[PDB]
Design a protein around this ligand. Sequence first.
Ligand SMILES: N[C@@H](CCC(=O)N[C@@H](CS)C(=O)NCC(=O)O)C(=O)O
Ligand SMILES: N[C@@H](CCC(=O)N[C@@H](CS)C(=O)NCC(=O)O)C(=O)O
Ligand SMILES: c1ccc(-c2cc(-c3cc[nH]n3)on2)cc1
Ligand SMILES: c1ccc(-c2cc(-c3cc[nH]n3)on2)cc1
Lengths: 198, 198
Amino acid sequence: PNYKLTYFNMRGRAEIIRYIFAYLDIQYEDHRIEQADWPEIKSTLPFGKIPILEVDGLTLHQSLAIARYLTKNTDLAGNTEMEQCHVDAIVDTLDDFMSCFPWAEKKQDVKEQMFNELLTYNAPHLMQDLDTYLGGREWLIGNSVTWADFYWEICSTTLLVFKPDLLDNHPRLVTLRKKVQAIPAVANWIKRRPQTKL
Amino acid sequence: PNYKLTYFNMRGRAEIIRYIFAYLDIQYEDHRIEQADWPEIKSTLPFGKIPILEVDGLTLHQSLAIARYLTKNTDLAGNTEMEQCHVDAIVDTLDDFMSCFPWAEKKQDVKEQMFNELLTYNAPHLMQDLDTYLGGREWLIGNSVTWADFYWEICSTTLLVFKPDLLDNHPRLVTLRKKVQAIPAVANWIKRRPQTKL
Ligand SMILES: N[C@@H](CCC(=O)N[C@@H](CS)C(=O)NCC(=O)O)C(=O)O
Ligand SMILES: N[C@@H](CCC(=O)N[C@@H](CS)C(=O)NCC(=O)O)C(=O)O
Ligand SMILES: c1ccc(-c2cc(-c3cc[nH]n3)on2)cc1
Ligand SMILES: c1ccc(-c2cc(-c3cc[nH]n3)on2)cc1
């Protein structure tokens, strides 16, 4: 099929889809929009949010819903029904935290204060829960890479921009990130992608 | 398998799971806890949050991850991969909205004001989006019921507690609520479930 991903010039919520496309060696158009053109585009969308993915003229929305669509019946999904459940739960746990940030807040002082709070007060507990959960496994779920591992590397990348010391007490989580980054198709993408703060 | 669902005595985030069990005619234990027992149970949970589902002694977390797990390989999931993407996207859209509400706000005036704001601006906006997305079609996705329709009925039921006229201008969304409620397994459940505000 012919793929067109539309999002802002950011890793943000589209990056998961971009890692999946890279790892699965699928070609697509990486369409990035400027903020000023967002109002026009937004007004033409059923739910007025991005990312969206067009597949042969059919518009799909919701970043995680798209990621599950693309990973279904590939080695990136869980190896069993229950593993699939753990993949989705780790993703959801990560998403629940990232969703707390007021990404679109216009008042800068209120925005950074909110960011500071979540990063200082909430992030360290997620890291603990994640670390303990990882236990002695090589990957978050089962015996091989899943898109939950990709989501972890993506989310932590952004958390580290704001809070570089986040993983100082979590070498096992630092190792997980490196393992994802060392995957040749993901490594190539990380190397090739437009460098953005977020 | 033996299934044990644990959550508060409330519809809340466990309800979608309860609807699915009912529809699929899968027997389970509906374990409802009290406040006083929360700290002890919480400490035992990897991510310290409920609902949790124990399957043959194996713990699963994240309500939507669980819901998707239970609907796997059934007509409730969406019949084809692409329709599954849409079921997932609608669920996510609804969950994104419900998450805006300060459910745990202890200052009654702030809670009243935020709810009213959300129900004055954001809710009417979403309802218009969902209404045009549903169109004159029977169900949200495809031509048979999915857990996205269940989730709409569930989410709207809780919103109707705070804005009883929320759907007065959306007869098509009321009709969808009625179609869901009237599914025999669902009608049965609604009648015998414990009565709670939320
Ligand atoms: N849960 C949704 C969130 C989508 C979302 O809120 N996207 C933001 C950008 S990351 C957006 O469209 N913001 C512009 C706006 O809300 O008008 C998803 O994962 O796709
Ligand atoms: N997104 C998660 C939310 C889990 C969650 O926040 N659970 C709440 C109850 S609705 C909870 O355990 N809060 C009390 C606490 O964290 O101590 C899900 O759908 O399962
Ligand atoms: C999960 C992963 C990433 C993100 C995210 C959202 C944004 C953003 C910035 C301006 N607008 N939106 O940046 N990162 C949100 C959830
Ligand atoms: C979807 C459906 C329902 C809910 C929800 C969460 C709550 C709640 C009340 C006190 N604490 N939490 O009530 N309803 C959230 C998302």
